[PDB]
Short mmCIF file of all heavy atoms in Angstrom, two decimals:
data_model
loop_
_atom_site.label_atom_id
_atom_site.label_comp_id
_atom_site.label_asym_id
_atom_site.label_seq_id
_atom_site.Cartn_x
_atom_site.Cartn_y
_atom_site.Cartn_z
N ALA A 1088 9.68 23.70 8.08
CA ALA A 1088 10.58 24.31 7.11
C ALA A 1088 10.68 25.79 7.47
O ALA A 1088 9.67 26.47 7.46
CB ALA A 1088 10.04 24.04 5.75
N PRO A 1089 11.81 26.27 7.99
CA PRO A 1089 12.98 25.43 8.28
C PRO A 1089 12.71 24.55 9.49
O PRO A 1089 11.94 25.01 10.32
CB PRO A 1089 14.10 26.42 8.64
CG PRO A 1089 13.34 27.60 9.16
CD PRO A 1089 12.03 27.66 8.41
N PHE A 1090 13.33 23.36 9.57
CA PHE A 1090 13.21 22.44 10.73
C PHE A 1090 13.67 23.13 12.03
O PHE A 1090 14.87 23.40 12.24
CB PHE A 1090 14.04 21.15 10.57
CG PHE A 1090 13.71 20.12 11.63
CD1 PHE A 1090 12.51 19.44 11.57
CD2 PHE A 1090 14.54 19.91 12.72
CE1 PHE A 1090 12.16 18.54 12.57
CE2 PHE A 1090 14.20 18.98 13.70
CZ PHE A 1090 13.01 18.30 13.62
N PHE A 1104 2.90 29.11 2.96
CA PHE A 1104 4.37 28.87 2.95
C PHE A 1104 4.89 28.84 1.52
O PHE A 1104 5.89 29.55 1.24
CB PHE A 1104 4.72 27.62 3.76
CG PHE A 1104 6.16 27.20 3.55
CD1 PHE A 1104 7.21 27.89 4.18
CD2 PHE A 1104 6.48 26.14 2.72
CE1 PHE A 1104 8.52 27.54 3.96
CE2 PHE A 1104 7.81 25.78 2.54
CZ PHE A 1104 8.82 26.48 3.15
N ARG A 1107 4.49 32.29 0.12
CA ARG A 1107 5.64 33.03 0.71
C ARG A 1107 6.95 32.66 -0.02
O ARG A 1107 7.74 33.57 -0.19
CB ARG A 1107 5.68 32.83 2.22
CG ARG A 1107 6.99 33.32 2.85
CD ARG A 1107 8.15 32.32 2.72
NE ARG A 1107 9.30 32.78 3.47
CZ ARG A 1107 10.35 33.44 3.00
NH1 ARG A 1107 10.42 33.72 1.72
NH2 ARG A 1107 11.30 33.84 3.83
N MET A 1108 7.18 31.42 -0.44
CA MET A 1108 8.47 30.93 -1.00
C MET A 1108 8.53 31.11 -2.53
O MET A 1108 9.63 31.26 -3.06
CB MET A 1108 8.65 29.42 -0.73
CG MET A 1108 8.92 29.05 0.74
SD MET A 1108 10.47 29.80 1.37
CE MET A 1108 11.71 28.95 0.40
N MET A 1141 19.47 29.90 -1.65
CA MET A 1141 19.45 29.10 -0.38
C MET A 1141 19.56 27.59 -0.67
O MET A 1141 18.79 27.09 -1.55
CB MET A 1141 18.15 29.29 0.41
CG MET A 1141 18.21 28.63 1.76
SD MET A 1141 16.85 29.19 2.79
CE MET A 1141 15.51 28.35 1.97
N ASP A 1142 20.35 26.86 0.14
CA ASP A 1142 20.53 25.39 0.08
C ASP A 1142 19.56 24.70 1.04
O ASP A 1142 19.41 25.18 2.20
CB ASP A 1142 21.93 24.96 0.50
CG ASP A 1142 22.96 25.00 -0.61
OD1 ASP A 1142 22.56 24.97 -1.79
OD2 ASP A 1142 24.18 25.02 -0.28
N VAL A 1143 18.91 23.62 0.60
CA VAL A 1143 17.83 22.93 1.37
C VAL A 1143 18.04 21.42 1.33
O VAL A 1143 18.15 20.85 0.20
CB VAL A 1143 16.45 23.25 0.78
CG1 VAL A 1143 15.36 22.50 1.56
CG2 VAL A 1143 16.13 24.75 0.75
N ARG A 1144 18.02 20.74 2.48
CA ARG A 1144 17.94 19.27 2.63
C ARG A 1144 16.54 18.86 3.11
O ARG A 1144 16.16 19.27 4.22
CB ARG A 1144 19.06 18.80 3.55
CG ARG A 1144 20.44 18.88 2.89
CD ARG A 1144 21.64 18.78 3.78
NE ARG A 1144 21.83 19.98 4.60
CZ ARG A 1144 21.53 20.07 5.91
NH1 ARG A 1144 21.03 19.04 6.56
NH2 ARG A 1144 21.75 21.21 6.55
N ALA A 1160 12.43 20.42 6.19
CA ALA A 1160 13.46 21.02 5.33
C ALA A 1160 14.48 21.66 6.24
O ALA A 1160 14.10 22.49 7.10
CB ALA A 1160 12.86 21.99 4.34
N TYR A 1161 15.72 21.24 6.10
CA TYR A 1161 16.91 21.88 6.74
C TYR A 1161 17.42 22.96 5.80
O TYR A 1161 17.72 22.70 4.62
CB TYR A 1161 17.89 20.77 7.15
CG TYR A 1161 17.21 19.62 7.86
CD1 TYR A 1161 16.48 18.66 7.17
CD2 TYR A 1161 17.26 19.49 9.25
CE1 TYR A 1161 15.82 17.62 7.79
CE2 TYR A 1161 16.61 18.45 9.91
CZ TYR A 1161 15.88 17.52 9.17
OH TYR A 1161 15.23 16.49 9.78
N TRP A 1162 17.57 24.21 6.28
CA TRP A 1162 18.00 25.34 5.41
C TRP A 1162 19.46 25.78 5.65
O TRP A 1162 19.82 25.95 6.85
CB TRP A 1162 17.12 26.54 5.65
CG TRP A 1162 15.76 26.39 5.07
CD1 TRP A 1162 15.21 25.30 4.43
CD2 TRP A 1162 14.76 27.38 5.12
NE1 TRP A 1162 13.94 25.59 4.01
CE2 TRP A 1162 13.64 26.87 4.44
CE3 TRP A 1162 14.73 28.68 5.63
CZ2 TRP A 1162 12.50 27.61 4.25
CZ3 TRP A 1162 13.59 29.43 5.44
CH2 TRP A 1162 12.49 28.89 4.80
N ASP A 1163 20.18 26.14 4.56
CA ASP A 1163 21.51 26.81 4.67
C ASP A 1163 21.63 28.02 3.74
O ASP A 1163 21.42 27.90 2.50
CB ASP A 1163 22.64 25.82 4.41
CG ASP A 1163 22.93 25.00 5.65
OD1 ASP A 1163 22.25 24.00 5.84
OD2 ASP A 1163 23.83 25.40 6.43
N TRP A 1164 22.07 29.15 4.33
CA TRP A 1164 22.37 30.45 3.65
C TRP A 1164 23.47 30.28 2.59
O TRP A 1164 24.57 29.78 2.95
CB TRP A 1164 22.77 31.53 4.65
CG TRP A 1164 21.99 31.59 5.93
CD1 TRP A 1164 22.45 32.04 7.14
CD2 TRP A 1164 20.61 31.20 6.16
NE1 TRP A 1164 21.49 31.97 8.09
CE2 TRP A 1164 20.32 31.49 7.52
CE3 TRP A 1164 19.59 30.70 5.37
CZ2 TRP A 1164 19.10 31.25 8.11
CZ3 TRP A 1164 18.36 30.47 5.93
CH2 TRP A 1164 18.11 30.71 7.28
#
Side-chain angles (χ1 to χ4, degrees):
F1090 191 73
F1104 169 77
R1107 168 280 187 263
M1108 289 299 293
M1141 188 167 72
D1142 275 339
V1143 177
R1144 287 165 289 103
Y1161 314 77
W1162 286 5
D1163 279 85
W1164 318 151

